[PDB]
Write a protein that binds this ligand. Structure first.
Ligand SMILES: COc1ccc(S(=O)(=O)Nc2ccccc2)cc1NC(=O)Cc1n[nH]c(=O)c2ccccc12
Ligand SMILES: COc1ccc(S(=O)(=O)Nc2ccccc2)cc1NC(=O)Cc1n[nH]c(=O)c2ccccc12
Lengths: 448, 450, 458, 451
């Protein structure tokens, strides 16, 4: 319970806390959700402060002693060593200034322990404002989440689906359109469709990266770069690209757009929301396929964790959450004013969560559900042999006219094509039973 | 780092964990969000397990010794003492069966420490299913949140807005329509409008309670009540009402509707979404009125936490955006039940209970640390009202609409009152006395306050 | 074509048009959607202008010959005779002032055809403003759509579901939880669930009416009532209630709230959104129960409404559940547009009214129409596959539980294993393991495996 | 009325109408919205039927005389002569079967007048299904709306915003963060931000075209191509690309994904929703800049439809944005709820995405031409406020100290004077700094970092 002195009086602070007065005031002002920044957001604030210190030292604006202490303190934060020194609520000042100052004060305290004295604002916040720092750390975290985590998780899910598409290439079954019996398909063809949806998901995430990776750093309070070196932005980005290996990080095309709006987060959420839509279709088909056994479709067996489809349920619930988060993101994105969008902490929480939920559930779905699915091959064939048939494959044998007559009589008397051919006395020199059965073969009808 | 034996192998459980093998499997199956049940949900699960034990004892189905240990353990859970014993992800099996089992296991381990042996399923889950318990806890938590926390928080914000509306009864200013100057209003009138929005919010929450407080308990696996006593639902609800004082808790009107759907959460979220919409309008007007101190509207000053950033309005508008997002996720889950069970309950419960908590906490902060301390630029607001082209219309009948337009244009260009412009243009005479001018340009009378 | 003169020049207007210069400007300014007001909004603007003329006449402000001509013209509009005289886009000035002036101009042109001169603004707009009128007409139209059309349509669907619940009271089947086999229910119990969802939907509409029915009329430009009589609102409301029988219409509790916000439309849309969520569950379950007929669940048969496919000549599709689910999607989209408009008012006026009004009134219309069609052309004609349903329930592992106290849970689980393996009934499997004798008669078995008693029907 | 028939039996039809039995059943089955297919959707169905008949002719599967009658009738449909012959509700069977059959029956009725007998299903629907035609028509209409209409409308809005950015390059004013006064910017810089948002919008639409332009045609009932030639898809797409000039049209990457899902409509709606979000920011800022003329910001004047104009075009833009956000939620809901071989939400998803394209196209051109192009800046006023703001005293701190900087800012606001004239009036010239140093430190245009 130490006490610190702030322009407006006394501030008691826990003794093991590396944060100082400004952070403690923010803890007292925003008791709203009881949840603070995630590890990914803390890491990104650490990376940004170390890179800013590096560029300020390289330009001779910051004494190398101070730069070295900030860089060492920043590397600790970026490595997860201080994820308990960020107690400010998500629902804070809309610039994220409070979390920016939290990072400054924690760095000042880490450096004081190694014998170096830093001013949180004058030293740790040199060449930065309260308004270009938090959106930069947000876009670093979002870009890392897309590139290093989500894309590889979706590729894992793609690869599991594609492996089933190949394994089940000739597992014939009935098609269903409008939930009603349709012509044959293979379980492989269905899984090739699921695989494409996740591949298109990766294409969607890749397509947003040119704008998701844009950083505001260098634009300072209003986007003009006042009180920062002219090249601060390009220099800081180059340090971040070198340290993270994230080639997608880049200076904003327009320094005003990069602070007045967070449109890059709205765009990216759209890709995540499309993936949630894709995953809902895949998960719903899979739990329906596994339904029953007696009262359902009983086409496949899901691995057990009468098995409940618990991972399709976790996938569909994650999809619901990404759709809600996406609505919250767009609402904050639309409501900027003049030189600043002041919904950054809320937008950051929601997009980083959507990235995390999709990454974690996709790897789980891939490994613990898709990879272990077993097909009820004999049951599926019996469903295919109960699908409607067509007369087209008899044309070359009985002619367009007779085929048309078979098709009409089958519909009138509610008989199969096969039985109708037999009942009309059509077996003979122009069509053996062998030919009939080859022409109407359900696997051939699936065109696999 | 202690070890337990499962039907499906072995599992290492932390030494100080009161959960057992089923919870630890759920921890291993669902590493998705890293976020578990909130305090309100955990409290509701404790309340429900206590009341179920009370009823099983009352009906002679459960030994009093075992009922007493469950009731004592469930009370500790309801009192918030075991919030770290629920590690299962929100994104679990859609019935919330995993969190149900988590409660049964924690109660058995609390009881063991006091010398009593409880089977988690056979004793703590007696008469209950994996499917009627979690939604009952959700509706308990949501009803308690609405009645005990959100309604009083909204009443505090209403009363703060109403107190400003009375203090500012005669604080005349320019109306604004389409953002353009318009005939006069008072700050008091505008704040009476904000107050009504918040009073209507309370009416909206009160109106959803007949369906939000419906509990599924007693419907067991599919709604039929198979393997429960016929009157289990009405008995457990009566214990819950006797213990909590929450008279809004009631057995569901239709036991199949209460498990096949969560329409009551969708309904309640719509009320919270309407409150978010209202708060967005109030917070946006307040940060605009405080804008400046030179190039903005500079109507009022917000208290610091007139160059103060509007941080509480920013907190309010961010919360409202979250409530809007949460509302979309709840409706999506709501729509997608199948046959006898809606399997989106954990996700729905997280979103509804968060929306209640954020709105409760931000409403009290907004009332106390923003509204209560606003200060109006009274003389400034009146001088702008008295200098507005919008107020020349009552001059038409004395000087004609052509000269009234000329007065408006000169007052604006010269930055003078309409009064001083009429005098300066030599219009005082038989067609218009100084007294008649002051009657026609009485901006407070134009506002028609009481 | 026929020329006119605005203050900003000369405007050409179609010959057959009762609108004038201001409406023709608004036609040229907002070529955005190609869609104008719906007949329900036009009707309400006519009801409102007639009530206003009647009150202005009663208070001695408007000459009786002018009041009578506005009243007669406004009755023609409210009766649907002039639905083609409102060409202005939905996406107009956010107060709806363009559509208000369209109404004033069309009433003046009707009065002129009978030899009476009305000034669109000073006569037809007397005691009104460009800001209290369009929201009043919107709330009249939404209240009418709720009370006269949606609630009776939902009652018709409730009554159809409830009749099925009663007809199928003894139609036993397996429950499904997580899409997996569960203990028995009846088709009647499931339909009683659907009925309750629609009855609750009616309760939700009724609960929003105290605020949906609030009218801004009398508040004029900013909510102060400047340039209107002090009691204009209570007088216009009294006439509207007497004429329409819509008892839910009332003057707003707070005149500022009623113009600064449209919270009553956001509230009502939430009720419509909840009905869309209920209808999605009901329609989804019904198409699943009708699925197949050979590769799906085949629990019920839906009445045939049209051919499904030319490739597959005899295939018939659940077209009404598809129409219901698509309507529900549109209602959830419209709901999001309404909340967005509702949040973004400023100071004395919300300027999203035309867009909010389009979305709320369309949600009312789609839910009313699709509910009636779903009740009459789908629910009413459903048939149950009773013998199929009972066969699965009598073969369910889930029904062995009541054998426990006779043969013990380990032997019950073996009966389940075997039944499910040998495709037998539980009853037959119990016989085929010789368990009938001392601790279990054949009558005692038939009593424990009574699947309808397991469903516990009232 | 006259009598017709289908597989289900006999139906009365308006004696006059060019549709037949299946269309009339659908008119009776679906009186829900009272709105039918839009011009763009009818056009797409006619283009597709003509292309299918051309390929069927080229593969010798359909007699030349029949293919010609279809191609001629389909040209009349695509050119917009027969729109009153499409009476079927949007809210129809979720495959759009009903509107497919409507196109087939109308084509057959047209060819009959010309004395040619076509079977709606056997000839006009040859090598086709319900399930592959309506989504193909939908993706043609959406691709055409993106490439030929929305991108050029956004480019016109970009150019108008960029022209303002250049004209207003030195129009210095107060920055605003949190709605509070901040260090200087120029109107030109703010408008360069708005231009970037719209340029980024065009980039978002272009990025979605590789999947928006994927066509289902050739997959028939379930995705397998049963009952069509193996290359029906590649041949029909080549005819569509040659007839429209839309090179973005392409065969589906996966024939099952292209019918089981409409994920390309969801993706495209995400781009449109983001544009709605950008236009909301741009329009809100412009109507605030024009607020007044006495009690608001009074930074600019919007053109009339001088100082007292209502911001009617910003109101239309923000109302259109609200509708695109609503439409977007409906499209995603439909997108998620496919089952097995078919998504049956196509007519509703098509209504919403094509409406969003249309609203954004039309409101963007109006905004550009009738609001942006005619804005006038209060140039001298904006500079005087910027020169009078407590925000610009900071560069004096090093000369006069924090305490005196604060006393200068306070007096400047109270006396409504410039910072320059408050520093002089306080007698601070001489000791602390010269007039040269004061004019260097308080140059508001240099502070905005503009030339
Ligand atoms: C946020 O609006 C203001 C903020 C501060 C001040 S002040 O106290 O500092 N005084 C002042 C006077 C002249 C120049 C600068 C400042 C005045 C204003 N408004 C105005 O000057 C309003 C105004 N009046 N008359 C005009 O013909 C006019 C023309 C264009 C734009 C606005 C107007
Ligand atoms: C929309 O803001 C304005 C609109 C019009 C005008 S004007 O051109 O018509 N001039 C004028 C001057 C005084 C009163 C009325 C008019 C000035 C203003 N702003 C201000 O007066 C800003 C301002 N400056 N200094 C203060 O100490 C102060 C105190 C409280 C609030 C604001 C301020």
């Amino acid at each position: 319970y130490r006490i610190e002195h702030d322009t407006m009086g006394e501030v008691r602070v826990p003794a093991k806390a590396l944060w100082r007065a400004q952070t403690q005031r923010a803890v007292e002002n925003f008791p709203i959700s009881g949840r603070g920044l995630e590890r990914t957001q803390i890491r990104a604030l650490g990376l940004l402060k170390g890179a800013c210190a590096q560029v300020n030292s390289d330009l001779g604006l910051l004494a190398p002693e101070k730069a070295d202490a900030i860089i060492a303190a920043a590397a600790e934060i970026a490595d997860g060593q201080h994820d308990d020194q960020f107690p400010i609520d998500v629902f804070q000042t809309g610039s994220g200034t409070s979390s920016n100052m939290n990072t400054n004060e924690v760095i000042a305290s880490i450096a004081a322990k190694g014998g170096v004295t830093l001013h949180p604002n004058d030293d740790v916040n040199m060449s930065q404002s309260s308004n270009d720092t938090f959106p930069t750390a947000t876009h670093i975290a979002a870009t890392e989440a897309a590139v290093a985590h989500l894309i590889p998780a979706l590729q894992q899910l793609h690869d599991a689906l594609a492996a089933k598409a190949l394994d089940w290439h000739t597992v014939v079954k009935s098609g269903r359109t409008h939930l009603m019996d349709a012509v044959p398909v293979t379980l492989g063809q269905e899984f090739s469709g699921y695989a494409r949806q996740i591949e298109a998901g990766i294409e969607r995430v890749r397509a947003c990266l040119p704008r998701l990776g844009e950083l505001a750093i260098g634009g300072t309070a209003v986007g003009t770069g006042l009180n920062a070196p002219d090249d601060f932005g390009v220099r800081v980005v180059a340090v971040l690209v070198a340290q993270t290996g994230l080639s997608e990080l880049r200076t904003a095309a327009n320094s005003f757009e990069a602070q007045a709006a967070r449109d890059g987060l709205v765009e990216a959420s759209g890709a995540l929301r499309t993936i949630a839509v894709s995953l809902t279709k895949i998960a719903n088909d899979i739990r329906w396929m596994g339904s029953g056994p007696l009262t359902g479709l009983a086409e496949i067996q899901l691995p057990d964790l009468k098995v409940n489809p618990v991972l399709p349920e976790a996938v569909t619930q994650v999809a619901a959450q990404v759709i809600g988060n996406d609505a919250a993101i767009a609402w904050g994105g639309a409501n900027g004013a003049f030189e600043l969008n002041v919904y950054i902490p809320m937008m950051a929480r929601n997009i980083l969560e959507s990235f995390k939920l999709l990454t974690n559930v996709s790897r789980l779905f891939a490994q613990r559900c898709i990879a272990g699915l077993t097909a009820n091959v004999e049951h599926l064939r019996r469903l295919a042999e109960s699908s409607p048939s067509i007369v087209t494959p008899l044309n070359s044998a009985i002619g367009y006219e007779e085929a048309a007559a078979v098709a009409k009589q089958a519909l009138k008397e509610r008989k199969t094509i096969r039985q109708t051919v037999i009942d009309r006395g059509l077996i003979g020199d122009r069509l053996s039973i062998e030919d009939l059965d080859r022409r109407l073969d359900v696997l051939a009808m699936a065109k696999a």
